[PDB]
Design a protein around this ligand. Structure first.
Ligand SMILES: O=C(CC1(S(=O)(=O)c2ccc(Oc3ccc(Cl)cc3)cc2)CCOCC1)NO
Ligand SMILES: [Ca+2]
Ligand SMILES: [Ca+2]
Ligand SMILES: [Zn+2]
Ligand SMILES: [Zn+2]
Length: 160
């Protein structure tokens, strides 16, 4: 596993997240279940706790956008770039963006939202990409859930 320069991590163990908008190809309920499961993957192995808020600014703002969407990481339409997230810190730190031009699903037909979200949240928590091919933080999409050992070691190094 790998961490970001200066080992970025959250100072508090009680973090908030907010789903700003939704993708059209999935019902609001399935999008919410996807993220709920994504956060659980990480809360189960760390002393971290996540609370979903609906108004205001949360520690982790989740949004869907297309092409140019407000930052220095524009999307590229169907396929290619799927999503990106920012490491722990103020402002957009911790935020996760998902390409709305993708066909997100709860199954395995298109790009599974849960698995991508789980990967992105790893970044939101302080983990950079891993060199271990079987790690969730490996930079390649492959959907077949139990968090691989490399990821557990990495996240527990930061918050354990
Ligand atoms: O790493 C990225 C972006 C890309 S990605 O958009 O293609 C991408 C995002 C999340 C992914 O998640 C998973 C990783 C591993 C497994 Cl097993 C499942 C999902 C995969 C690719 C594109 C640029 O180069 C690295 C990969 N940020 O998370
Ligand atoms: Ca894309
Ligand atoms: Ca933040
Ligand atoms: Zn973005
Ligand atoms: Zn990544």
């Amino acid at each position: 596993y790998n961490v970001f320069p200066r080992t970025l991590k959250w100072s508090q163990t009680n973090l908030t997240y907010r789903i700003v908008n939704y993708t059209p190809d999935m019902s609001h309920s399935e999008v919410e279940k996807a993220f709920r499961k994504a956060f659980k993957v990480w809360s189960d192995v760390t002393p971290l706790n996540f609370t979903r808020i609906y108004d205001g600014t949360a520690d982790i703002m989740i949004s869907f956008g297309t092409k140019e969407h407000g930052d220095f990481y524009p999307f590229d339409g169907p396929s290619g770039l799927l999503a990106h997230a920012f490491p722990p810190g103020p402002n957009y730190g911790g935020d996760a963006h998902f390409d709305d031009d993708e066909t997100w699903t709860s199954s395995s037909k298109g790009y599974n939202l849960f698995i991508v979200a789980a990967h992105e949240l790893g970044h939101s928590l302080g983990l950079d990409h891993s060199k271990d091919p079987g790690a969730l933080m490996f930079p390649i999409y492959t959907y077949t859930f139990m968090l691989p050992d490399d990821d557990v070691q990495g996240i527990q190094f930061l918050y354990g």
